[PDB]
Amino acid sequence: VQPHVVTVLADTAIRADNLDEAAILEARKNAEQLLANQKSDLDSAAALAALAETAAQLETIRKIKNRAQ
Amino acid sequence: QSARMVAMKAATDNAGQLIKDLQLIYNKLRQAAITQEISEIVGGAAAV
């Protein structure tokens, strides 16, 4: 507290009236973990699959260049 | 996030250069095959 300014450095500062926000903090955690799940899926499912796919049979084609027939 | 963008850009570049490779390969292989069956045809027609 200062004669004009007050700062509140709270660990967990939540706009609320009652100590019952447990119903919304879990919702926040589920949102974060769900978006993490989206990250893990779309990074893996898109790339890692396509990572293997794009590298399928390159040398098979590279050797059959020098075929003059 | 930054490094993922960089890596994916590099993947795009690799794919593009390979794409150029594949068009050239397809072109030459198609030419060679076509010429080959042409040779077969001209050999065959010479018979009868």
Swiss-Prot record, chain A:
Determine the domain of life of the protein's source.
Bacteria
Signal peptide location:
none
Localization, UniProt: Cell inner membrane
According to its UniProt record, which protein family does this protein belong to?
A: Belongs to the ATPase epsilon chain family.
What is the protein's known function? Produces ATP from ADP in the presence of a proton gradient across the membrane.
Subunit annotation: F-type ATPases have 2 components, CF(1) - the catalytic core - and CF(0) - the membrane proton channel. CF(1) has five subunits: alpha(3), beta(3), gamma(1), delta(1), epsilon(1). CF(0) has three main subunits: a, b and c.
Full protein name: ATP synthase epsilon chain
Q: Report the portion of the entire protein shown.
A: 71 to 139 of 139
Swiss-Prot record, chain B:
Name which cysteines form disulfide bonds. none
| Subcellular location, record wording | Cell inner membrane
Function statement: Produces ATP from ADP in the presence of a proton gradient across the membrane. The gamma chain is believed to be important in regulating ATPase activity and the flow of protons through the CF(0) complex.
Q: Per the similarity annotation, which family is this?
A: Belongs to the ATPase gamma chain family.
- Subunit: F-type ATPases have 2 components, CF(1) - the catalytic core - and CF(0) - the membrane proton channel. CF(1) has five subunits: alpha(3), beta(3), gamma(1), delta(1), epsilon(1). CF(0) has three main subunits: a, b and c.
Tell me what this protein is called. Answer: ATP synthase gamma chain
Tell me the gene name: atpG
Full-sequence portion shown in this chain? 242 to 289 of 289
